[PDB]
Design a protein around this ligand. Structure first.
Ligand SMILES: OC[C@H]1O[C@H](O[C@H]2[C@H](O)[C@H](O)CO[C@]2(O)CO)[C@H](O)[C@@H](O)[C@@H]1O
Ligand SMILES: OC[C@H]1O[C@](O)(CO)[C@@H](O[C@H]2O[C@H](CO)[C@@H](O)[C@H](O)[C@H]2O)[C@@H]1O
Ligand SMILES: [Ca+2]
Ligand SMILES: [Ca+2]
Ligand SMILES: [Mn+2]
Ligand SMILES: [Mn+2]
Lengths: 241, 241
C-alpha cells in the first residue's frame, strides 16, 4: 500500500497484529516492554520489543517516492530506584529484525556489542529516550539524561538534554518530512514542559524500501518499567520537489 | 488497533502485505484474481483471492464496540465470450479463511458445494458482482446479472439488477455504519450510471471479533478476467447502544 495507518488508543490483551520479541507483553491495557514481577515491579537484565506486523513502504525506487510519516505515542517510566535504566526507543528497521545477541542494557536491544558504533554494519533509525549514562558502560552517551536520534549507531547523531520523571507520561510526536528530509521529534509532559530535536537524514540511503516500525526497551543492572501506553502511526508515499 | 487504514491507488508487483490464494497474482499494476494465459486472455477453471495481511478488529465484546468501515475499490471484467463468468466479490471472513474445496465457478471461491446455502455452516459477508446466472447451474441466482449481498450463503439476501460492461471500470463504495447496522453498496460507471443496494445486518452475530478482508473471483466453464484496479480501506471501532 501507498498509505497505511493504525491507532492504538490503548493496548487490550487480545492483540493480533503485533510481533512480540524478548520479554514484551501486555498488562493493564499497556505494553510492558521490559519484564516485571508478580507485584508489578521492574527487574534487572531484561529486553523487550514490539513491531506492527504489516510492513511499511518507506520508499519506492521506481516511482522515486519517499514516505512522509508520523508516529505519535506516549510512555511512562517507573522505578523504586532513582537511577532507572536503560531507556525506551521508537525504531524503524528491516522487516526481519530480531533482538541481537547481547543487546541488553545501554544497547537498548537495538544493537550488537561488536557493531554498536559501526554505521556501515547496521540498518536502523531510532528515537531513544535514554535515562542511563554512566561513562564506564555507556561511553558513547553525553553525561546526562537525553533524547537522541540514532542512525545506524548507538551513539546518537543528535541529542537534547532530557528530564526523566518517574510515573509521568511523556507524549511524543515523531515526523519525517521527505520534502526537507527532516526527522522531527517533539516530546512534552502534561504540564507543558517541551523537548525538541531534529536531524536531516535521507532514509533511502539508510533503510530498505520496506520496513517495520516498533519500540524497544531494556534494563541492565539498573532497572525501570518501560510502559508504552498508546501509539498511532501513519505513512504516505509522496513525490517530492 | 482500534483503527486501521490502507490504500492501493495501484498494485505494483512488489507486494508485502497481501495474502495471495489460488491463481491470484499481480500483472500490470493490477491484481488478476483469475488466471490468464501468456496473451492475457482469461481461461476456464480458475479461482483466486487476496487478503490484506493485517487483521481488522471488526467488533469488541468487552467494550461493546463495533467498527465503522468503508471499502472503496474499482475493477473491470473482460471476455471475448458473450457470457463471461463467474464474478468478483469483496468479502469479510475469519482470519484463517482459505479457498474451500470445490468452490469454483458459481460459488465464487467463497463457499463449499455442500453448504453453499447453509447459513449456519458459514461465516462470511460479501458483496458480489455476479455475471453468470444460468438457471440450470446457478439455481440460486435471479435470472440476470446482478450485485448481491451475501450473508453466509451464495443465495444473496438481497440483489439488484446490474449491467456488465466489458472492459469498463466499476467504482464501488461499501460502507457499514454500526449505529444503524446498515451495509450500503454504491457502484458507478464513468458515465454516471449508478447502482445501490442496502441491507441491515448486525455483524456481531455473523463474524468473529477479528477478521480479514479481501476479494475473491472465479471462472468455471465460462470465463473472463477479474481485474482489481485499486482499493482503499478504513475502519474504526465506535460505541454503539
Ligand atoms: O462458469 C459458468 C458455470 O460453469 C459450470 O456450469 C456448467 C455445468 O457444469 C454444465 O457443464 C452445464 O453448463 C454450465 O451450467 C455452464 O457452462 C460450473 O459448474 C458453474 O459453477 C459455473 O457457474
Ligand atoms: O560495574 C560495572 C557495572 O555497573 C554499570 O556500569 C552500571 O550499573 C553496569 O552496566 C550494566 O548496567 C547498565 C545499567 O542498566 C547498562 O547500561 C549496561 O549496558 C550494563 O552493562 C556494569 O555492568
Ligand atoms: Ca544509555
Ligand atoms: Ca452466479
Ligand atoms: Mn544515548
Ligand atoms: Mn448471485
Amino acid at each position: 500500500q501507498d498509505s497505511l495507518s493504525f491507532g492504538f488508543p490503548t493496548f487490550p490483551s487480545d492483540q493480533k497484529n503485533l510481533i512480540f520479541q524478548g520479554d514484551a507483553q501486555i498488562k493493564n491495557n499497556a505494553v510492558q516492554l521490559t519484564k516485571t514481577d508478580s507485584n508489578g515491579n521492574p527487574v534487572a537484565s531484561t529486553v523487550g520489543r514490539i513491531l506492527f506486523s504489516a510492513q511499511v513502504h518507506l520508499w519506492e525506487k521506481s516511482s522515486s517516492r519517499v514516505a512522509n510519516f508520523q508516529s505519535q505515542f506516549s510512555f511512562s517510566l517507573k522505578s523504586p530506584l532513582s537511577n532507572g535504566a536503560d531507556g525506551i526507543a521508537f525504531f524503524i528497521a528491516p522487516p526481519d529484525t530480531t533482538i541481537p545477541s547481547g543487546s541488553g542494557g545501554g544497547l537498548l536491544g537495538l544493537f550488537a556489542p561488536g557493531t554498536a558504533q559501526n554505521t556501515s554494519a547496521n540498518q536502523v533509525i531510532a528515537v531513544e529516550f535514554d535515562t542511563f549514562y554512566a561513562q564506564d558502560s555507556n561511553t558513547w552517551d553525553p553525561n546526562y539524561p537525553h533524547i537522541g536520534i540514532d542512525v545506524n549507531s548507538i551513539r546518537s547523531v543528535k541529542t537534547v538534554k532530557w528530564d526523566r520523571r518517574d510515573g509521568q507520561s511523556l507524549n511524543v510526536l515523531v515526523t519525517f518530512n521527505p520534502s526537507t528530509r527532516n526527522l522531527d521529534v517533539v516530546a512534552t509532559y502534561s504540564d507543558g514542559t517541551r523537548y525538541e530535536v531534529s536531524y536531516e537524514v535521507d532514509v533511502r540511503s539508510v533503510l530498505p524500501e520496506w520496513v517495520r516500525v516498533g519500540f524497544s526497551a531494556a534494563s541492565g543492572e539498573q532497572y525501570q518499567t518501560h510502559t508504552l501506553e498508546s501509539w498511532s502511526f501513519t505513512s504516505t508515499l509522496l513525490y517530492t520537489a
